[PDB]
Design a protein around this ligand. Structure first.
Ligand SMILES: Nc1ncnc2c1ncn2[C@@H]1O[C@H](COP(=O)(O)OP(=O)(O)O)[C@@H](O)[C@H]1O
Ligand SMILES: Nc1ncnc2c1ncn2[C@@H]1O[C@H](COP(=O)(O)OP(=O)(O)O)[C@@H](O)[C@H]1O
Ligand SMILES: Nc1ncnc2c1ncn2[C@@H]1O[C@H](COP(=O)(O)OP(=O)(O)O)[C@@H](O)[C@H]1O
Lengths: 520, 520, 520
């Protein structure tokens, strides 16, 4: 091509390489593998827009409106993109900074990235690195191998044709970390130089967005040079608002109907949200709404009616009987059972820690006859030592609260902590395990709707934990009233919306004597 | 021919390159290493259509009539396809979805794919991805390679000559998966970019069907993309209906016979179903049918008989003595063996959990040594943990129901849980294990036809399980008369057809105390 | 082409190679794979410098100014570079010594490297051999590869184009090590012998600089040729000075502001340091400062205000509630817990060891019945043996100091050493373990703000430890006043800056009896 190279602002290096390329095309003859190689290399080097970028949209109020009018919530993503706009304005050129959205699945991480692109007026392009093993798919490979293609980044640059295409590397925590590093690095950016080509490409001003469900698996070489932002799950009422304003409209558009035919009530949407779904995003809720509208469309095209109104009285005919008929596993907990607030890789959960005697306690202690503890729940070494520490503090606390009670000392116990949480949050069930052992020993059940979370140590101190937002959302959607937290987490509980702290009686504690007071 | 491309309807983007390569092809004479094959590079694209989307019928009445004519049951698939047609008619265009049918072997998935194709009037094309590893076949190679094969999707487009051919991938749970992803991903769908053709195709209109036996093997990036529909097994009377109405006609028209030439009886068909087959599908049933029919054919053509008619008494002259005389391993179960339903990759099943004693009891054991338990059955870690939990609960439940009994606490037992259940349905034999240990310890057997299933917790809560339809079918076909289910599975049992749940006596349950009260 | 060599010194050795290869190219015909391959090999052979040296600055005062004016502290590195320039001067040219910086992350182990490249007027280059595993990325491939590119230093010479480039090997802990030796070995520095270049490549002039968090996981063969220099962390005052001189200006410039619009007061900077960061470097502080500055930029551009002055009473707006609202775990320690002063891979850190008495005292029953010690903290074998040594010594010391006390000898204890230290510094908690055991046994706490370290042997001899600078910095950060050290560490405690050793009363000891007399 001639105008392709003409209209762009290309550097002397690529000018030299394309000059030698034209020369080689002038030295070879038709019908030759060499000429095919040279011509494909030429078209590759010619298809990239150098110095050609897209004029971004920098009105603060217009960006705010674009962001807010097609996504509920996500206030911190909105704030961050607004700060990005403001810095790119106070500077001259474009910025091109790296981000990472982490949170449960189905909360809006990819759609918010599309909307960020639509607000920046930049082009868009995405790809995943969950099912990726070859460095080739990122950095290409030389023109010598038979099947030659340039590693999806030059493929991008072609497919989008602009200097700052807002890439989206989905699912970076489930991965070729070498090429990923070489791509996400302010100092290793300005020249990339994939294997296929031999010219270095200048991608310093493209803003990469990444996604992940959990930070703790993004390799630290990346995690260091990548700014983390949380996109948390929703409570029933935010799920309802999301539903009414975005889920049902575009489902109707997808199934070809309109509002004057298929009407979903707020009552049936809450019935869906509370009975037919359990996640903390809106993925399965959207599946159910699509099912409702498909069966509506059928009952219309057939002719069973001309307009369908879905109300809790006739819901079953569209989807069926409710799948989640209970709120928790236990309504009123027996003695050795306590409710904790696990932080999983899909949001939160209210997991039940259960203890039970394992061998008859009929023994007058003729001699030493120590007790023991058996533990299950696929525990690692960190969690096994946490359970030992919690066992020992339980012994030592019942040693002084009621010395006559030799249950925990001379008795064989089986403890079960279910397998939800992530290894970082694993040893956050310390106070739950302590309460479970103590309730089994005393023969008294815990307070009824009481969920707790926090780390415990031999001396009894309650150390802080993470994931307070997700744990609180899970306690909320599991029907919890009281909630015990480490008094060093009073920050990230009093910054949640008043939606999530409606009727939660929260107790911020420093030592386990306080948890023992409240829980009894 | 230029006539063909000219006839095609507006692939203008492709036509640019089509000219830029075809004028060069025709520019160079034959006897040219490049031209010989660049004629193929033209013929392929010329054969691949671009604008023709074959007529699709949107008649709900006729589509229902054709669906219910050549496939018994499968009303889930039939409802889904009817909703599909209704939606594709409400939208003025064809749409194209991505559906995946899962179920045991021999339930009709491929055959109903054929029926769907001929019912929507779309073309048809199937292929397998069972043991394929290379991406050379799902996406094709490039010209640099010595071979020349444009994959399978381009092959389909050529063979059918339409852009909505309803491709059918088989054994998708046995796959290399990146290409399947890029194929069935509506994000990466609108453009495909095979290797042998650098031109994109609009697959956003074909109706992808996948068939899998077990959904769990389907990698997650696909499992969340395809819509998973279940096709269940077949009770005996449904098997008989299928054989009478479809299998015997197919085998006849396979061996050139007629209703007067060679006839099979309903009584001999039931006899065959019950004695010569054990599966949940109808594959072995059709194999027996076609063997009987080809034996009949040999007899007739040799003239050893005329007007051959198969009866229960001359059936042994065709297939010999039965294969499965006995219903199941036991009819009267001794102490320590109970019948548990399982959900294997082959569908439902009925297995027997067995317990035995390993070391003699008689011992005035000084020191009060602790009883043990050796679990065999080729278990995973999850099943080992779950058997520990069931063991502890059995000991604890006996400790308070029969305080004098010390069988479980101090004795060395061996538990064999037979190995059929999928890794997901592993810890579903929990209540059968508890019952086996308890019946061994109490010396008494459980009541006769008392299959059961459900997860058990450390304090006894019976937790819901999956695969209820398959398990109910396999309890039906084993002489089971009382099945014991977790209470939260009513929404799964009370929606089975009237003939499936016909003779059963079902006890839904929430805590093991009641399973104990209805087993002893 | 030749015009490169037309003015460039090349060795008589490689000259025969290049001329023989030009001949063996001139005999063969173009439009050939072998033509392109030999051409590429020659282009690599010629793309590298062979005699040209950067006219390195040798003005001692110039290099000293260049250093001093872009880094606070690092006296050791700056002195070493000044002496290196001195020897470079007194010789004709220099040899490019090997060097290694070690210390906590975020202290400047890279920016000082680039400043050194500046003051030597060489260029810069870097690469990390942490994440890699194969020696390919360093040693390149032979001529007989499918299609290859050379080792890393070849790309370095291509993108630097002088014989002494000052490259930087990074993350030398996470490592092939033999290859890095053959690279960093004087006798064979002058001979690389990349399989991609048959001629020996000299490297006897480039100075390599490596980086590390800890010098113990660097393999000894490499460590023999590396001259170790330490770059420690900082204290509150040093962090404040770096933030005022470097961090705030660099961030403001990055954001596109000026001095008058956005300013951060000394109070708010010490607030950020002491409150929103718990590191030893300034890595997180950089993020916490440019976050403030981009929120400032938002307020400015978006018209919220035309000037901003971030102050201690409006910082919570810019960042949020304080993150770290506790200097340490216990303000006043119970009996049985002592501060630890460990030296983790991330830098110094104060740790608390606890003891609990996991089992009742038994009321001086007649039996001999020795006590025990369960230990948690994810130890190694050396640490478990050091714990047993501390246990024995504590029992013995209590025997000969309060012979009437039976606690340690007949009692079952639970010790927990937190899992923070390094493997080599593990047995630097012996005196903390002894203090904790004796504190629990006697039944009374230790001096309030007292931290200790040092190894202990059976006879109670305190043995010297390492990491005194980092332990002292940590002890300062955690608000410790009294610090107890081995008497053989006054060499490296008294060479410490007056910043660090100011507020601390420091007790050097030789035996444990003095630690006792101090702690009680
Ligand atoms: N706050 C929200 N506003 C509007 N739509 C939302 C919101 N949160 C989730 N959704 C919808 O939920 C669906 C989840 O898909 P997606 O966000 O792509 O999954 P993931 O978050 O794993 O990328 C999207 O279709 C999106 O439209
Ligand atoms: N419900 C049914 N109605 C009619 N034919 C059936 C039915 N179920 C199974 N078949 C017969 O079984 C065979 C289909 O087996 P197939 O579905 O290919 O096995 P798989 O289930 O492993 O894909 C066909 O001959 C089909 O006619
Ligand atoms: N002593 C110092 N003098 C000046 N700036 C410093 C100093 N220490 C750290 N910095 C700044 O902090 C950042 C440190 O990051 P970096 O040095 O790359 O981490 P590492 O030390 O692990 O290589 C740099 O931006 C640097 O400007």
């Amino acid at each position: 091509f001639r105008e392709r190279l003409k209209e762009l602002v290309v550097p002397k290096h690529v000018m030299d390489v394309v000059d030698e390329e034209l020369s080689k095309l002038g030295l070879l003859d038709n019908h030759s593998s060499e000429f095919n190689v040279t011509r494909n290399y030429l078209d590759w080097l010619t298809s990239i827009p150098w110095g050609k970028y897209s004029n971004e949209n920098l009105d603060l109020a217009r960006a705010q409106a674009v962001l807010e009018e097609d996504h509920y919530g996500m206030e911190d993503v909105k704030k961050r993109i607004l700060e990005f706009i403001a810095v790119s304005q106070l500077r001259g050129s474009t910025q091109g900074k790296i981000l990472c959205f982490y949170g449960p699945p189905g909360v809006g991480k990819t759609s918010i990235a599309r909307s960020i692109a639509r607000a920046l007026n930049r082009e868009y392009f995405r790809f995943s690195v969950g099912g990726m093993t070859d460095v080739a798919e990122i950095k290409g490979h030389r023109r010598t191998y038979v099947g030659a293609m340039p590693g999806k980044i030059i493929q991008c640059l072609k497919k989008t044709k602009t200097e700052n295409p807002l890439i989206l590397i989905d699912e970076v925590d489930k991965i070729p970390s070498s090429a990923l590093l070489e791509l996400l690095d302010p100092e290793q950016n300005a020249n990339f130089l994939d294997h296929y080509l031999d010219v270095p490409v200048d991608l310093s001003k493209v803003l990469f967005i990444c996604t992940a469900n959990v930070t703790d698996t993004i390799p630290e070489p990346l995690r260091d040079r990548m700014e983390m932002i949380n996109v948390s799950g929703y409570v029933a009422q935010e799920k309802l608002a999301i539903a009414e304003r975005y889920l049902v409209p575009q489902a109707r558009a997808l199934c070809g109907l309109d509002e004057s035919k298929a009407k979903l009530s707020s009552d049936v949407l809450t019935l869906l949200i509370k009975q037919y779904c359990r996640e903390s995003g809106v993925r399965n809720l959207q599946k159910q709404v699509e099912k409702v509208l498909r069966k509506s469309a059928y009952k219309i095209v057939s002719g069973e009616a001309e307009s369908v109104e879905v109300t809790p009285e006739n819901l079953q005919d569209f989807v069926g009987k409710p799948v989640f008929t209970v709120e928790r596993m236990y309504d009123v907990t027996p003695p050795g059972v306590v409710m904790g607030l696990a932080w999983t890789a899909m949001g939160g959960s209210t997991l039940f820690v259960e203890t039970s005697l394992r061998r008859p306690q009929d023994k007058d202690a003729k001699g030493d006859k120590d007790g023991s503890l058996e533990v299950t729940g696929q525990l690692g070494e960190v969690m096994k030592e946490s359970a030992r520490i919690a066992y020992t503090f339980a012994r030592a606390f019942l040693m002084q609260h009621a010395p006559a009670n030799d249950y925990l000392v001379t008795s064989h116990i089986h403890l079960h902590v279910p397998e939800g949480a992530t290894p970082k949050d694993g040893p956050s069930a310390g106070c739950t395990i302590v309460t479970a052992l103590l309730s089994l020993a005393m023969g008294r059940p815990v307070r009824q709707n009481l969920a707790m979370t926090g780390e415990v140590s031999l001396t009894g101190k309650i150390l802080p934990v993470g994931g307070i937002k997700e744990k609180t959302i899970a306690a909320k959607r599991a029907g919890v009233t009281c909630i015990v937290l480490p008094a060093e987490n009073k920050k990230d509980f009093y910054d949640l919306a008043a939606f999530i702290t409606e009727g939660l009686e929260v107790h911020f504690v420093e030592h386990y004597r306080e948890i023992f007071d409240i829980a009894f």
